[PDB]
């Protein structure tokens, strides 16, 4: 890929999004701690990427979460995600501890709701990371969300992998891999 660096809240943190990826904050206020990236690409335009152009990006600076175990933290964060789409069960389509005690990333899919009805309507798949800045008593949890199209979406109840999902994790762990504190006054 060809991610390129950006600051986050201020300057306090870096780390990559993909080329044609505007900065929500610079057009809608955004919660104070987001930070929101959207695919603006045009369809014509073509980027060795993989991704498409309807991809969004959030990074939140959580509070960390009691629970010891790096994939126990991650699998708490990824229901408070997928609880309020009506999800009530999901699965991890890929996972990986990228780094022991802080380092977790992962695709997560949604395969049951509370209407019963997991194919009412468009799969969105959610790529997901946990960065635990324990020292700081902050969970930062990145999510990228992949809204499928129906060609995609057969291929996954087919038990494969999409391509542009695999894009999308690749991108998921090089945010992960170049994420950068550059001034810890933002956790005062």
């Known amino acids: 890929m060809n991610n390129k660096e950006v600051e986050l809240y201020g300057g306090a943190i870096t780390t990559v999004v993909p080329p044609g990826f505007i ?8 919660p104070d ?12 335009e073509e980027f060795e ?9 959030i990074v939140d600076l959580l509070e960390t979460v009691d629970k010891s175990d790096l994939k126990e933290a991650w699998q708490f964060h990824v229901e408070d995600l997928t609880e309020l789409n009506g999800t009530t069960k999901w699965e991890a389509l890929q996972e990986d501890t990228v780094q022991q005690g802080t380092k977790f990333t992962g695709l997560v899919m949604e395969v049951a709701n509370k209407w019963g009805k997991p ?21 930062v949890v990145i999510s990228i969300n992949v809204p499928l199209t129906k060609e995609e979406a057969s291929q996954a109840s087919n038990k494969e992998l999409p391509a542009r999902c695999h894009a999308v994790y690749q991108l998921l ?5 170049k994420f950068h504190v550059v001034d810890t006054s933002l956790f005062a």
Do not use: H, K, W
């Open 49 to 57: 990427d993989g991704l498409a152009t309807n991809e969004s990006i």
């Open 33 to 44: 701690t987001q930070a929101v990236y959207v695919n603006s690409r045009r369809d014509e």
């Open 173 to 177: 762990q090089e945010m992960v891999r």
């Open 119 to 139: 194919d009412l309507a468009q799969t969105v798949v959610i790529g997901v990371a946990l960065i635990r800045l324990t020292q700081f008593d902050t969970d």
């Open 23 to 30: 900065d929500a904050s610079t057009l809608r206020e955004v």
